[PDB]
Write a protein that binds this ligand. Structure first.
Ligand SMILES: Cc1cc2nc3c(=O)[nH]c(=O)nc-3n(C[C@H](O)[C@H](O)[C@H](O)COP(=O)(O)OP(=O)(O)OC[C@H]3O[C@@H](n4cnc5c(N)ncnc54)[C@H](O)[C@@H]3O)c2cc1C
Ligand SMILES: Cc1cc2nc3c(=O)[nH]c(=O)nc-3n(C[C@H](O)[C@H](O)[C@H](O)COP(=O)(O)OP(=O)(O)OC[C@H]3O[C@@H](n4cnc5c(N)ncnc54)[C@H](O)[C@@H]3O)c2cc1C
Ligand SMILES: Cc1ncc(C[n+]2c([C@@](C)(O)OO)sc(CCOP(=O)(O)OP(=O)(O)O)c2C)c(N)n1
Ligand SMILES: Cc1ncc(C[n+]2c([C@@](C)(O)OO)sc(CCOP(=O)(O)OP(=O)(O)O)c2C)c(N)n1
Ligand SMILES: Cc1ncc(C[n+]2c([C@@](C)(O)OO)sc(CCOP(=O)(O)OP(=O)(O)O)c2C)c(N)n1
Ligand SMILES: COc1cc(C)nc(NC(=O)NS(=O)(=O)c2ccccc2OCCCF)n1
Ligand SMILES: COc1cc(C)nc(NC(=O)NS(=O)(=O)c2ccccc2OCCCF)n1
Ligand SMILES: [Mg+2]
Ligand SMILES: [Mg+2]
Ligand SMILES: [Mg+2]
Lengths: 582, 582, 287
């Protein structure tokens, strides 16, 4: 039972109604950078004893932090920005959150209402700009709507298919006095009317049926199962079906597990893509048949009965047509199928050990492999050591590129919400701020940003934030002086012709440039470099043992190539398994 | 007569047609950060001998660089980005360019056409997102349209009221072979049909008439006169009317000149706002009656016959209703009025010396003034010294906040395109990248980014770009450890209650944090700090004399307040002239 | 052509919508506000400074009254055929210029503009910007309900009239005294006129009658009126016109008068689209 800081009949500013609306939602943390159009909100925040502001150094930093907070916790992330350039600096964060179905509530100051449309100081039509890159947005036109709109935005951000919701609040509404009414009903008739119902046993039994009739089943698991870790585990033991996961699903099913095919898709393991190529039953739980995963669709699971369980009806049959479909919460579907399974255990007598054996042969012929050249540090090996020394218990955020694939391939996520990575938009500069949010959400966790030198520098300014907020963020910076992923494609398809993919200084072409250690020094963050594979393990141990934030600059030969690789739009028969830039 | 690198009958990739389309436009410089959806364009660029790519470290860096290039030269600035997060990182740049009427051509890679709408890898509907923050945009749907669309985008970006135009190019169009047709006509019937005609002498004579009938005339000059420096100078000598300028007009009329009222508006000089308050004839040339400038509109030039000459009919009578109006190029209007004036010189016998005297009394009672406390460096003084030691010849870019007002107030711009500053959006992080573009456009100029510590850090990563491109950018970093402008408003209107406006480290509350010198060191840029006013002049001299880029960290007491200040929406009678945060 | 329009005038534009000011022609002076106030203010100044001004434009007014005399609006009368212009003029005469006039769109609309003398505003109800056919009959229905004691006449054309002919049911049932002066030429006349001037009188679907019985008035608008119990009559001879219209006016309740007219008439004068004054057509028709 909530206790306000205002008399139930005492008028207060709209800014204060808005902060209390946040408190009544359970918010403890927001990422807010102040500006003229949001100064009132920032004053109202200083008056809240229960909400902490982490002030970033760039609003993109702020929104990416709110994403990290969300992805690492299952709570919504909250960023606040001023109008104009404040608001426009959130846009990559919003698009990112929408594509990965991450729950986010973005609040932006706006010019006073009478000023809207007039090309006023620091005005941009942010509700127009973001309409196609948010799940929903709002322009508050009256202080009386603040309670109801905040409640609707949280409800839309976190229910159904989660995603970002943006609320534009004009400065004059922030200043208007009023007495909030917290009993207002929500105005979401259609949306609520279309929320999926719990699954019918009609559909659930038909699936358990198809399982027993099948000889080569594969689970195809994605971001939609991140709240189903236990149900999915139970489901796997009652059926012993092997588990392939998407980039977003990592850690739903434990990475180090005998039944685990690891990740599928363009950079999936040879065995996981094999399982799908030759399966007869494909259990697509919480996935969206993305082109990174399917390649040529006609070729994808070309001879499988496809069971698609998704909470968003628009996803069902959108790229691949399922045989069976179930529009609902995969967590419920698993709970129902698990009852049927355990009960009808005997009549079913489920044993796929013979299919599991065909795959463990591929798993043995074609494991993920890396070369070690001289004393040069292999990035794959560095991640593997980080896994070893953290006992697979760290929260890992990443940038985008080769280092991201390696952090996917060579770290064993045990639980969901350990892996924080931009999958759909693929936004560089995500790693450092996302670690900031994950740390604040998980103050006792090991938090490591496995970053690349291009991605890392894009939001390097957030090192100030880490230092000032005294967050124990570790940065494992895999440094190859290149935009490596674009470099790799230059190698395969453009005859290694380099078009602006080198990040160092051509004049001193053999010096590590820039010197990330000095970036850390500028913000008072202990840091070290390491070049010889011999020194790697003690280097990483040092990073882990040194209390507080820490940057480790890990130098790596740039000619590495993420493998395997099915070229864009290809089939399994096109999978590249060998080669690099040498 | 252009020479292609391809036979006139030889098919080439769409990417190559696009680069040649740029060459045929005169482009020599582009700011492009490569990604998957634009790799083809980057390969095509490496094949051009006449186009240089400055690779930034963040696409916001790239677009702000293209703005700097444009604003410092009068040529269009060209940035290129990949799809998805590349494109969304341009958005603040586009909005900025649109609000300041800066000519810009932004090219973004897009997913292949067949993929559009499918939530494909790194897809965002950028044409939707940017429609309201660009002058116009395009989604190329066929390689045959590349010549015509590039020609239309440059023509729209640079003609009329200049602004940003964005061209989205799907990856498959970049790869398609074709034979360009460079003779295609442009499809802009309506736009071309509505281009203003040259001014009629009917309207021009009526204005010169109103001048002779008037006793207290004021010129009100803005960004629209940046190509009219000579005509406007001539016009001022034939009439001796005093000249007030907006933030965007600085340097149209020379800052150090007896007839110069300097800048008007919310932080305008007391005398310039006085001239307007009490004028009877207001010559509004190339301005848009912005709220920063007018305050309460009914009070603005409340007793003046208002003559508004603007090239955009939508601006005329949009906030203040003119008596006379002229929709056309102010440069022509000046050339016409100058003929009438010089001819009818005798019959007119124009002498405003008595009004000019009333103003030179205000100019003497209420000049811009700053205090000097002990040995603490006053920011105003540092800018004045920079002016002295550069002889008013530097190109000055800035961030946003107090330091921006000071760079406006205490530097004497002699010509237009010396002052590069975000006026309408007011986007922090603009200064460093804008200096990068201005330097590349003006390789023999002194280029100085007068920046604040909040703004500077937002795009600190572009120091890598400065170093690698061996650009002689000087950074005069005015450091007060605060978001000073929001701090100032906290002081006046919120009882100095600080809500997240302190940028240093609360734990070591008296150390300069971060240490910008180490940011410079990381990128191999010579740097120094300075704290004592005694050392300032030799410090700045050093920065200027040291070849190549250079950062000077100038420490400043934070309690300074930009003055004078007419509070938002006020009248002249409300002008604050005294006070700070002490 | 805008460049040609008032090419040598100081233009004063008083409009209540700022978006209209300088949108197609650039004024010298502008005033964004209610023209009613602007007139009240200028009228005070005028009456006060009457003497110092000594305003006399009689010499310009004379230059124009010469044009007004050389080039008045004119129509031919062929035999006993009813000229539409004349029928409207008679309606004006017999109503004393006091009727509320709604119209359809086309030639008949221009004639109702040219040959009726509106004395006050809100007497003339006509679709000007969209130019929507079928507007006349329903618009008269609304005007009648708003002005139950007024003479209400829908000066309509046979194409426009039929488009919303169903509203005759409404007139009858609501017992509205709507009079219909239907100028009938069996053609989409305005498109016909343009066919004549610019397409060599080649007819593309502008004939509204029955090609099989090519000389019978088709349809028979009198029966449309009969279906809804509205008294109606036709008239073909100019001799019978004045008594016909008088009958329509004197018969209480709604009434339809079908006025047959030679179709070769042309609304004049005409400045062709996008032209200047120097291009004004003043003579000619479809004969
Ligand atoms: C450089 C790079 C390379 C990449 N290559 C690969 C690759 O080789 N393999 C790969 O897998 N990815 C790859 N991607 C990532 C990729 O583009 C997509 O982000 C990923 O494939 C999609 O993950 P997903 O299918 O799990 O769907 P998500 O984006 O995780 O969406 C979850 C789905 O589940 C649904 N859902 C959500 N909640 C529930 C619920 N409670 N119940 C039921 N359904 C729910 C949503 O409606 C949606 O359909 C790569 C990314 C990058 C940057
Ligand atoms: C912190 C801060 C404080 C500020 N305070 C002030 C202040 O005190 N004073 C101030 O002046 N600004 C101030 N501003 C800047 C402000 O918000 C606007 O950017 C500025 O007032 C508008 O400049 P402008 O009127 O010249 O119009 P611009 O944005 O420069 O537009 C130019 C105008 O001229 C027209 N035009 C362009 N080319 C031509 C041509 N060839 N012929 C004719 N017309 C043409 C365009 O159609 C447009 O109407 C401040 C900004 C910030 C960030
Ligand atoms: C904001 C932004 N701009 C450009 C991008 C386009 N991409 C990529 C891709 C995969 O999306 O292909 O397009 S990955 C990549 C290069 C990675 O830089 P690194 O981290 O230092 O090196 P690493 O060795 O790969 O680990 C670029 C330039 C992007 N996604 N985001
Ligand atoms: C991307 C962005 N985010 C927030 C902004 C809102 N504003 C400002 C304003 C004037 O627009 O009022 O809103 S100015 C300002 C603080 C200036 O930081 P400094 O340069 O280090 O210090 P200085 O001492 O003022 O020189 C902020 C936070 C902005 N415009 N852009
Ligand atoms: C819904 C609709 N459809 C077609 C139209 C296009 N126009 C016209 C115009 C002037 O807009 O030129 O386009 S006028 C006209 C023909 C008039 O038919 P009439 O009333 O019986 O004959 P009258 O002898 O001209 O009085 C047509 C077909 C229109 N405006 N509205
Ligand atoms: C230098 O200018 C500053 C600086 C600071 C710190 N704050 C303010 N505040 C206001 O201008 N408030 S405003 O009156 O409501 C207003 C009036 C008109 C258009 C937009 C408005 O608000 C949004 C503007 C940014 F806030 N202005
Ligand atoms: C890791 O994935 C990478 C990495 C790199 C460097 N490049 C590519 N290129 C393609 O995917 N080209 S694509 O086939 O036309 C394509 C297919 C589907 C959706 C979008 C597509 O393009 C835009 C994607 C980004 F480019 N993919
Ligand atoms: Mg790298
Ligand atoms: Mg500062
Ligand atoms: Mg007709």
């Amino acid at each position: 039972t909530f206790i306000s800081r205002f008399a139930p009949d005492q008028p207060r500013k709209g800014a204060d109604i808005l902060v209390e609306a946040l408190e009544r939602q359970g918010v403890e943390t927001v990422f807010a950078y102040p500006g003229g159009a949001s100064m009132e909100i920032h004053q109202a925040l200083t008056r809240s004893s229960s909400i902490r502001n982490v002030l970033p150094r760039h609003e993109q930093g702020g929104v990416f932090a709110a994403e990290g907070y969300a992805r690492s916790s299952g709570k919504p992330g909250i960023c606040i920005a001023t109008s104009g350039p404040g608001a426009t600096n959130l846009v990559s964060g919003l698009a990112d959150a929408l594509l990965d179905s991450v729950p986010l509530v973005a609040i932006t100051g706006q010019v006073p209402r009478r000023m809207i449309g007039t090309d006023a100081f620091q005005e941009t039509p942010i509700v127009e700009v973001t309409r196609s890159i948010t799940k929903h947005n709002y322009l508050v036109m009256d202080v009386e709507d603040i309670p109801r709109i905040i409640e609707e935005a949280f409800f839309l951000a976190t229910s159904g298919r989660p995603g970002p919701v943006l609320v534009d609040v004009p400065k004059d509404i922030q200043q208007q006095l009023a007495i909030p009414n917290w009993e207002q009903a929500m105005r979401l008739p259609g949306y609520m009317s279309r929320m999926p119902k719990p699954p019918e046993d009609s559909h659930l039994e038909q699936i358990v049926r198809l399982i027993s009739e099948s000889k080569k089943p594969v689970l195809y698991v994605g971001g939609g199962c991140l709240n189903s870790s236990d149900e999915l585990g139970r489901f796997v033991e009652l059926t012993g079906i092997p588990v392939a996961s998407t980039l977003m699903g990592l850690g739903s099913y434990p990475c180090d597990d005998e039944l685990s095919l690891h990740m599928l898709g363009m950079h999936g393991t040879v065995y996981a893509n094999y399982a799908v190529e030759h399966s007869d039953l494909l259990l697509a739980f919480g996935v969206r048949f993305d082109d990174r995963v399917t390649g040529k669709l006609e070729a994808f699971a070309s001879r499988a009965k496809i069971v698609h369980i998704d909470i968003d009806s628009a996803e069902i049959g959108k790229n691949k047509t399922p045989h069976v479909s179930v529009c609902g919460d995969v967590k419920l579907a698993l709970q129902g199928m698990n009852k049927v399974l355990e009960n009808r255990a005997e009549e079913l007598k489920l044993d796929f050990g013979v299919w599991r054996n065909e795959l463990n042969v591929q798993k043995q012929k074609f494991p993920l492999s890396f070369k070690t050249f001289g004393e040069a540090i292999p990035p794959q090996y560095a991640i593997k050591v980080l896994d070893e020394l953290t006992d697979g218990k760290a929260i890992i955020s990443t940038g985008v590129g080769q280092h991201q694939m390696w952090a996917a391939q060579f770290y064993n996520y045990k639980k969901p919400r350990q892996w924080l990575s931009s999958g759909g938009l693929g936004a560089m500069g995500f790693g450092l701020p996302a670690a900031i949010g994950a740390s604040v959400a998980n103050p006792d966790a090991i938090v490591v940003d496995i970053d690349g030198d291009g991605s890392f520098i894009m939001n390097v300014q957030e090192l100030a934030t880490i230092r000032v907020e005294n967050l124990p963020v570790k940065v494992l910076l895999l440094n190859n002086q290149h935009l490596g992923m674009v470099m790799q494609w230059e190698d395969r398809f453009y005859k290694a012709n380099r078009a602006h993919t080198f990040l160092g200084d051509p004049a001193q072409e053999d010096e590590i440039f820039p010197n990330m250690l000095l970036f850390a020094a500028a913000c008072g963050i202990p840091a070290a470099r390491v070049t010889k594979k011999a020194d790697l393990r003690e280097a990483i141990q040092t990073m882990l043992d040194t209390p507080g934030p820490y940057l480790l600059d890990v130098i790596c030969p740039h000619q590495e190539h993420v493998l395997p690789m099915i070229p864009s739009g290809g089939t399994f028969n096109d999978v590249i398994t060998e080669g690099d830039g040498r």
